[PDB]
Amino acid sequence: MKIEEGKLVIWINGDKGYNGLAEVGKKFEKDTGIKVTVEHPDKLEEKFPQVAATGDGPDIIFWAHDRFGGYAQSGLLAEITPAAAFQDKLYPFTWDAVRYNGKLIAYPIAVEALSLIYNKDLLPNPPKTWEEIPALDKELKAKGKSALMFNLQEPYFTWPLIAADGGYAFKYENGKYDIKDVGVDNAGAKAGLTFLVDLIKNKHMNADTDYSIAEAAFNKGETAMTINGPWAWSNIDTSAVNYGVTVLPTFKGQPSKPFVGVLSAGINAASPNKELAKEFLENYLLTDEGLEAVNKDKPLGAVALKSYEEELAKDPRIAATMENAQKGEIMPNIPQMSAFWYAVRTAVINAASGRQTVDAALAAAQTNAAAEDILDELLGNMV
């Protein structure tokens, strides 16, 4: 049915603190009378542009900022108009993540980066380099354990290694992304993905490992290390594993470069509740108490709100998150990002499984990531 006037429907991914967000919604309803319903549908980031194009969907959509330029290009997001006093409450770099064609298209919530998570009892001194992992795994297999398991099905988790020696999505210069300069099939990307594939060939990782498998193995104490983001920490806590969060290993002496996501909240252009959505986001969620309620459910990472981040930054896990973030890069928000991710997803899965060589997999991903731009040129108006 159509978006209901006089309530708020929110979509947020199932790995985030949606119960905590619902608590913020309950407070909003207690104070204002406006009911807030939080949902976590599957593939919400693919459902949103479909339903919103027909004028339906949630009033508010949460995702990392990389999806939002495509939504804005399709006219699916309301422009957001925080006063200068409110903008000053959040870190400038988080506003830039949600700035598209010079306009703010979402509210930034929290800064996410992947870190190396390690079991301190199994591995008191985690490896500084990727190159050490094979030997460390042989040592741990002799103890009935393994060195490292992390999700190999989503390119977010393998990108830090692919980028380390030179892979990139779109070249960034003059404050702008050059969509004609894609770095998926260059020598640095091949070197990193070759290292990953060699880990699999040499029985240090399995191509089929997904999020659930890696999480279960780490939280059961079966593997010494995983790679994950802040939202994963609360399940590790309840598992009673003594864990640390640290800088990702280097590759060829270069830092791993995670793609940094800013969890962001956009307002559906078709919402009849844009004013209520702004009041909820600015004056209930983006407060110390609102972010704390979400954070106590699943940790958000380094929040965009300065007053609360000043407390969270004292947590060494947050310091590690931001150390990895600073070595990585902010994701582009441009519409071409989704095609980039779908292309790299296929390349990593096909190379890891041996369906394609690293070279063929990345050559195809480079083309796929650029496919619409290539077509624009083929059909172009040129002399």
Binding site: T367, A371, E372, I374, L375, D376, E377, L378, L379, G380, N381, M382, V383
Partner: protein
Amino acid sequence: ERPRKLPQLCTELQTTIHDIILECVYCKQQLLRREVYDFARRDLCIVYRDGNPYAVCDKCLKFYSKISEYRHYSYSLYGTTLEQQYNKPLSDLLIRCINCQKPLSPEEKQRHLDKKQRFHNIRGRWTGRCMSCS
């Protein structure tokens, strides 16, 4: 800058359209001779990857064009509105057939005007239908 049209590419390579060997930018397969001639007749643009020139084969052109239409269709306008928006007659605008990618002739554009057939915008590209693609 590099040649964007087949004739200039042929001149630079001191070859002719009858002799030139081109590969598809997407699949890297060699174009059939028929595809080379069609590339030129459809006024397509040579594209450069890693500093090397490429054309496009018919299978890939149709595949990515269909995707682009299905995902990036926006809206439609009558020809007179295009003429007001761009301040030019249709004859001066590049409008390709949505099916065969050929630039529409002036007579085909005037046929759109006379028969009240709108043009469609896909990713900023304005399209109609030539006569052949009925």
